[PDB]
Design a protein around this ligand. Structure first.
Ligand SMILES: O=C(N[C@@H](Cc1ccccc1)C(=O)N1CC(C(=O)O)C1)c1cc2cc(Cl)ccc2[nH]1
Ligand SMILES: O=C(N[C@@H](Cc1ccccc1)C(=O)N1CC(C(=O)O)C1)c1cc2cc(Cl)ccc2[nH]1
Ligand SMILES: *Cc1c(COP(=O)(O)O)cnc(C)c1O
Ligand SMILES: *Cc1c(COP(=O)(O)O)cnc(C)c1O
Ligand SMILES: CC(=O)N[C@@H]1O[C@H](CO)[C@@H](O)[C@H](O)[C@H]1O
Ligand SMILES: CC(=O)N[C@@H]1O[C@H](CO)[C@@H](O)[C@H](O)[C@H]1O
Lengths: 786, 786
């Protein structure tokens, strides 16, 4: 009870932090609390892992280069059902728990959607009581902290481990060596990989508590450690430790840096040896082991498992290749060509010479089969080989992932279809059953219970709390479609969120927020395919309109656009500057006043999403049709009371399917409209003329209305937009703006706006990661939710 | 009590190590025990520091680049009087406490004597209840681990923090910035050091418990942290963190590397700001603050205090210079010229431009005074300036330390005299009272209670335990000079030690130890002035003797020579190889058998000294007269029951004074004999001829009797020995060997050998670091032992 939580807290402050109430810092209080909460995890954690050893159910291994975990304290208190008791204990000790919680750094070991999907999967897998493990890398530095300077993004090192991480547990007894470079030696004993450089891998375990179910799983992250001048030799140990130093900040973009390849083989080698070791405590290996490949990043795992089976375990190739396919499953997360992993055979040859041999082997057996089925289709061979002979020979990691796995899945109906029927038509045709779909999901714990306590409560007061573990239960909120009191209560919750988040924007930015305006938000990583630009074109279009007619009845808006750009992404940085430039001109214009305010949410990250999302009314999901494989921010917003304005793309389609197309503000081109416009040939100049408001928008940008001191500042954008916009911004502008007006129309009718919201929330059940995982478990890993 | 200790232990294993008895590793048990013991320090630690704030007694700041701490567990158990209870609790839990204690890594943040003197001082200062703080650097890597390969020393990184350090406490709220490089601007608002690069200093506190007295002091060690390509920019953060990465492995040798200068200014800047900060919570500054400079390593502290006083606090130079001198005190630790710190004004100018100006200033005021006293003695000026104009201009840090301090002390009568009357005659003549002596000491806790429980007990059973806190009490062991039972008991203790340490040498080295042989040991850092060579010449001389006459009644010996060589010290490495070569030839010779065995104690360090020292009979302290400023290993051996064979050097002289010259085996040249032989001119070839046994020794070395495969392997040694031996090995060989025979003579008479031992142990009271500190407190820091 509260009493014991307070005693424990004091115990830790004293013994663990060596402090008194007269000298304890705010940080000391947070750590003391974390420890107090952390202790409640031990019993179950040991019990859970022990239970997996005893009953030996098939285990699931989620192998990913990223895990966008966020903060742990609160999530752990909720899932353990200790939040209310802790809130009380901390209150009685004269402290502000919210204040202590803010001290915790986000474990931002991910770039965005992909990394966050891994985090939601862990929570779900633990909640469904599955024997699942997350295997990744413990980056000393996660995704950079974003700061805006002179309207531009500046990167600062995210030194999240500086003051310590109470949620991680070093597991020194499981350290393992990883090999790099060296050479292949073909002898009578077989193929040996010798003269390699060694790097030690030290695993760090982090508990993953299921929601109210006694289960605490593990996320094992590996850290790299080192195994002429003496002083300099010691310093060069840093070179080996550089492997797990920092997470590559690219979202949907392939950068073929050697260090990156090292990280990939690193996590792959350590993980597989650790799995093998655990297994031997091989015919039944795939009946006990399931390894999910999160995108092609861990593709090397396939030839590494083979290498272990063949070179170390001495199994015959045929047998080894069979077990491998039954062990792996591959998830495809993108369609953009510049994101595709294609490593130069030269780099791989030098760094992983034995693996290159193995990949060649795989390809040989693979291609021989194709001929043994289509003896004359010559172009089909090169089209299907894991090797791209064009110019400089490179490896198509996706193809390696397809042949080395028994199942390949996309992350949304539309996406999976494109992956199965177009992108990999040749492979799907040969192995029909291999390709599947598994529509993404988000955990309703962090993205509802934790981030929106007001909503969670309102809902539970109307239909009970069964919905937490079975989100489909939300369909019962339909019974309240005509209930005016409930609808007023729904909007009240949304209002409290907006008021709390406003006070946040107030202290952070010198802008007076119209608490009654509509919160128009587009938060996600900055990328042309995501179109923060199109949105920006709209904001500017609204600016002008107010100038021309400042008396016109206008629904006030607070437009929020936030997200980080990859350091080496020039266009994204230009767009950020463009937006901050626009914001300044709009925010300070005397005629616009509290009618329209533009904010660029700085340092958008998981813990910040938990704040802004619940305070949103309008969710911007406007990616060009066919570009966003699925999206998950769209779901978070849907579940949190916001209406969506977007294209029929990724999971947006299924959101319309569930809620009813009429209850979402769909617009612009669809997958086929994009195809047609391609064949014809896109010429942005035409819309620039046919659409008068656009021309004005564009001219102001290019003329320097938003960049006086630098008239041609944004020329790079104009240039791209007019002759190199592979994402057709102008082509959806008319429909987009047209759609936006309608959004404001509905907003004026509170009763109708909230009616549509209710239909959205009541239809979000399908997007719970719990449903996603049950499908993965049943149709891919073949494991049972206990 | 035992019950509670066992409960706590289990609590930590579970909550802190997340383990059960079925899965806990030996490392987990050690950590669980450490935490159990560590908790007993919290109360007193907070109380002690709080007490210093309230009563505000003058504080002592021991500034050192090194703190050779060793292991903490046992020391802490003893000083807190918990060892017996813990031993019991661990036994009842079915564990071996000795086994757990061996898991702990030595905090080898020192090279040898100097670093260990700092560690003994901390223990003593805490035992005397003084308000003392140790300020140093937290090296990620301490002194390298030594391994012997093919008879040669090989260095391995001492990654002591890999598995964590339970004895350190991060103090994030006291982090501070340190500046490097930049340039200077003398504005009308004071001098400004701008455009500097910043490096953050994060302090880590370690508790220093006094022996049975409620006092727990602090040792604050600073770690360096960082405040174009994005990935590479993040990696370059390592460059700043390199500052506190590794301890320079040089013992009595000056290496002018820039990184070293950085470490020095680093610890100096952080320490002084932290002291200033604490003080302001300036006329009374020196009445509250005393900063001891451990050698010239932290010399920069003088101009840094001035810089703070003048450039930041805006005090007038005159006033600032006055407070500075009253604040600092300097301890001189060496006489060898190649060890003297003399930084090139160019390096300092680039890295610390403002400090160079300040040093120039100091020198100016300084030299003006000299002329204002000796208007014509021109050569005296350059002879006394902090600047050496010869060739490339450099700074004499010793001279900076003399003028910036109110007191300078040597570490032994003979040494302090040489420092005051010869080396700094010009300074001592001007400021007579400034130079003092403070003979070194060792703490009787670690070097008696902890390392030799058998002896400590025997002694306490005869005269009580008051001796622990007042070692002079040992003089009472005289009453037992004729007591045969006591003498038999004394030798019994020595025997148990030898048998336990033998089992150690047995498992580590494949050599059968004659448990009844005389343990002849010389353990210390490897250096020509220390003469492991002369010893080696003796071992070889004993080898031959046995060959010529294998029937001769010979007192069996086990010669142990151990120590690390500085990586860049070629001669030292040659000597190590020479010794291992000799050992092999002696250890395997069928005629010598169990008559003589040679061992090269590998990886000699603090925890290892605690093992071998108590097992020693004969302590080798044979440095050339005038080279060893003091020595402390000599004291440890004296206190532990060994007889000493050595020259009248360092503290060896005072050991003879205390015990009676006849009760030590002194020999060879004395300080004056060295002077004479110099003036005349040393010609090693002469002794090579006059001494027949030597010629044989030498010829065997040079001919390849110990290096068949490489006949001229040791030519480098022979060369040095015949034409470049600035330490006159041959000149003391005759006396040395002569002395050695006498040692064996006495050994045959157990009753007489133990009689001399008793006189040694009974006279070691003076060498307690408690006495040394009382003198420092009373005559230098002016603080009162509470
Ligand atoms: O480090 C101690 N506690 C730990 C407590 C802790 C552990 C994990 C996360 C947050 C806090 C501590 O303060 N830190 C570990 C972090 C790091 O490695 O940077 C900071 C500690 C308690 C204690 C008590 C005594 Cl008597 C002596 C030394 C001590 N150290
Ligand atoms: O780090 C934990 N305990 C600590 C315990 C410890 C602390 C200080 C020195 C030695 C051991 C730990 O195991 N280490 C700190 C060392 C390092 O920094 O490498 C290794 C820990 C306990 C725990 C319990 C739960 Cl439920 C979840 C996470 C957890 N971490
Ligand atoms: C969920 C989430 C994302 C994913 O955004 P999309 O709009 O689906 O690309 C990105 N960043 C954070 C911090 C998230 O929580
Ligand atoms: C005490 C000690 C020293 C000093 O040895 P001397 O022989 O006194 O120079 C050096 N190293 C270690 C590990 C010590 O314990
Ligand atoms: C390569 C990559 O980061 N892919 C991202 O993955 C997430 C999770 O599947 C998708 O929702 C998103 O649309 C997609 O852009
Ligand atoms: C440079 C250096 O390490 N000096 C050493 O200091 C210790 C402690 O004062 C002396 O006992 C020793 O003789 C001397 O060689």
């Amino acid at each position: 009870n509260v009493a014991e939580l307070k005693k424990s807290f004091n115990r830790h402050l004293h013994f663990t932090l060596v402090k008194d109430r007269n000298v304890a810092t705010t940080r000391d209080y947070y750590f003391a609390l974390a420890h107090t909460v952390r202790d409640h995890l031990v019993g179950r954690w040991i019990r859970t892992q022990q239970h997996y050893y005893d009953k030996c159910p098939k285990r699931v291994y989620y192998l990913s280069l990223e895990f966008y975990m966020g903060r742990t304290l609160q999530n752990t208190m909720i899932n353990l059902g200790l939040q209310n008791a802790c809130d009380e204990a901390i209150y009685q000790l004269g402290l502000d728990i919210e204040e202590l919680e803010e001290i915790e750094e986000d474990a931002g070991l991910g770039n965005g959607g992909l990394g966050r999907l891994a985090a939601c999967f862990l929570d779900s897998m633990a909640t469904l009581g599955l024997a699942a493990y997350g295997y990744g890398i413990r980056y000393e530095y996660g995704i950079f902290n974003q700061k805006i300077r002179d309207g531009w993004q500046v990167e600062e090192a995210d030194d999240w481990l500086r003051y310590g991480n109470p949620w991680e547990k070093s597991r020194p007894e499981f350290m393992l060596p990883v090999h790099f470079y060296g050479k292949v030696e073909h002898t009578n004993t077989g193929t040996k990989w010798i003269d390699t450089q060694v790097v030690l891998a030290l695993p760090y375990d982090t508990p993953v508590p299921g929601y109210m179910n006694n289960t605490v799983n593990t996320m094992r992250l590996w850290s790299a450690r080192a195994p002429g001048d003496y002083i300099q030799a010691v310093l060069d140990r840093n070179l080996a430790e550089n492997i797990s130093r920092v997470l590559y900040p690219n979202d949907n973009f392939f950068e073929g840096k050697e260090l990156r390849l090292k990280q990939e083989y690193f996590v792959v080698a350590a993980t597989l040896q650790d799995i093998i070791r655990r297994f031997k405590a091989f015919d039944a290996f795939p009946d006990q082991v399931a390894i999910q490949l999160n995108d092609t990043h861990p593709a090397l795992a396939i030839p590494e498992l083979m290498r272990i089976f063949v070179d170390i375990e001495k199994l015959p190739w045929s047998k080894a290749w069979e077990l491998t396919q039954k062990t792996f499953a591959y998830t495809n997360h993108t369609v953009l060509p510049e994101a595709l992993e294609r490593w130069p055979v030269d780099l791989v040859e030098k760094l992983l010479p034995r693996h290159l041999e193995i990949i060649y082997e795989i390809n040989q057996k693979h291609l021989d089969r194709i001929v043994a089925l289509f003896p004359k289709d010559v172009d089909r061979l090169r089209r299907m080989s894991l090797i791209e002979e064009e110019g400089s020979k490179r490896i198509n990691m996706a193809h390696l992932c397809i042949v080395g796995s028994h199942a390949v899945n996309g992350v949304a109906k539309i996406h999976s279809d494109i992956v199965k029927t177009k992108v990999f038509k040749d492979f799907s045709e040969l192995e029909p059953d291999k390709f599947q779909n598994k529509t993404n999901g988000i955990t309703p714990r962090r993205w509802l219970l934790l981030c929106n306590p007001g909503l969670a409560e309102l809902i539970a007061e109307k239909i009970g709390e069964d919905y937490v573990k079975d989100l489909s239960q939300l369909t019962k909120l339909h019974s309240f479609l005509g209930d005016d009191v409930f609808l007023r209560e729904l909007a009240k919750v949304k209002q409290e969120n907006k008021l709390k988040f406003s006070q946040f924007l107030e202290t952070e930015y010198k802008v007076k927020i119209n608490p009654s305006s509509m919160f128009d938000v587009q938060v996600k990583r900055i990328h042309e395919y995501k179109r923060q630009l199109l949105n920006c074109l709209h904001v500017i279009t609204m600016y002008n309109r107010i100038k021309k007619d400042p008396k016109k009845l206008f629904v006030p808006r607070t437009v929020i656009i936030g997200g980080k750009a990859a350091p080496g992404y020039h266009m994204a940085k230009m767009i950020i500057k463009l937006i901050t430039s626009v914001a300044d001109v709009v925010n300070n214009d005397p005629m616009v006043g509290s009618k329209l305010k533009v904010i660029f949410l700085e340092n958008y990250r998981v813990s910040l999403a938990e704040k802004v999302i619940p305070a949103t009314d309008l969710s911007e999901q406007i990616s060009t049709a066919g570009t966003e494989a699925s999206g998950t921010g769209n779901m978070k917003f849907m579940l949190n009371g916001a209406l969506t304005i977007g294209t029929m793309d990724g999971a947006n389609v299924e959101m319309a399917e569930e809620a009813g197309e009429e209850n979402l503000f769909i617009f612009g081109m669809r997958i086929d409209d994009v195809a047609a416009l391609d064949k014809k040939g896109y010429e942005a100049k035409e819309y620039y003329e046919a659409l008068p408001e656009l021309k004005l928008v564009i001219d102001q940008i290019d003329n320097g209305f938003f960049s006086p001191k630098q008239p041609d500042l944004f020329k790079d954008i104009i240039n791209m937009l007019f002759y190199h916009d592979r994402f057709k911004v102008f082509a959806d502008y008319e429909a987009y703006v047209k759609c936006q007006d309608k959004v404001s129309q509905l907003y004026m009718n509170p009763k109708a706006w909230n009616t549509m919201v209710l239909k959205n929330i009541a239809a979000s059940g399908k997007f719970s990661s719990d449903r996603t995982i049950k499908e993965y478990a049943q149709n891919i890993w073949n494991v049972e939710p206990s």
